[model samples]
Target: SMEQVAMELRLTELTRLLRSVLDQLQDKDPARIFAQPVSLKEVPDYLDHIKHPMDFATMRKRLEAQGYKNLHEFEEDFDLIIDNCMKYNARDTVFYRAAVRLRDQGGVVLRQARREVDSIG
Candidate 1:
């Protein structure tokens, strides 16, 4: 229906926009992701009209596998993003941040652990 079509188009735009923003990031000094803001602004009102319904459980888990310095930092940064989205009435604000925090916690670290002894003779 119209709603589903709208949702798909909106997601397509959102995904493309996110990638474009990320691509613009320079080689890391602080190393983060996105934006139009110099300081992470709120999302605009019109954005609220956009709708998407999809499960990103695997994607969330993928983000969870990444490293973070500490919980507070993760919360703040993730909150900042959610705050932006919420400002525009975005859905899943809590869900997104929750998953983002997961990005910091899980068992697998993106960095190489000192592997199992290569050929335990």
Candidate 2:
């Protein structure tokens, strides 16, 4: 019971944190600027698509054209994006696995909660 209670509390906290992050990001309406649905699943493929030396050279050139001045600066920005994407992917995978486990055990909890509620009624 304690393990179930702790897990339920943790899941609630994680859901709340996720919602808060989404609310902050949504306040900026980032989708309006990006104009695309960013998917963690596609990040690996997207990075591979841009991994060629020629692609890097072109990207550097484009950044320089936009007055980025320092190649290191652009590289740092790219690194940050990659780091965040990897973290997001890992977090998503963990969440999905936990969700599957929860689903598998859902009926047990549902019956327990129903009994508790009925006791109050």
Per-candidate TM vs. native?
Answer: 0.25, 0.29
Among residues 3 or more apart in sequence or in different chains, the pairs in candidate 2 whose N, CA or C atoms overlap within 3 Å are none
Tens-place lDDT per residue, model 2, 85-113, is 34434555743343334334433543444
Candidate 2: residue 95 Cα off by (Å): 29
Q: Estimate the Cα RMSD of every predicted model relative to the unseen true structure.
A: 17.7, 20.8
The parts of candidate 1 lying over 4 Å away from their true place are 29-121
lDDT of 1 at 69: 27
Report the lDDT tens digits of candidate 1 across residue range 11-121: 554444333322322111122332223222443543344342112222233224432223333334434443444444335665345434434432232111112111211
Tell me the lDDT of model 1 at 68: 29
Residue 90 accuracy (lDDT) in model 1: 33
Alpha-carbon lDDT, every model = 0.34, 0.39
lDDT of 2: 0.39
| Number of the predicted model whose lDDT against the real structure is largest | 2
| Clashing residue pairs in candidate 1 (N, C-alpha, C atoms within 3 angstroms) | 64-103
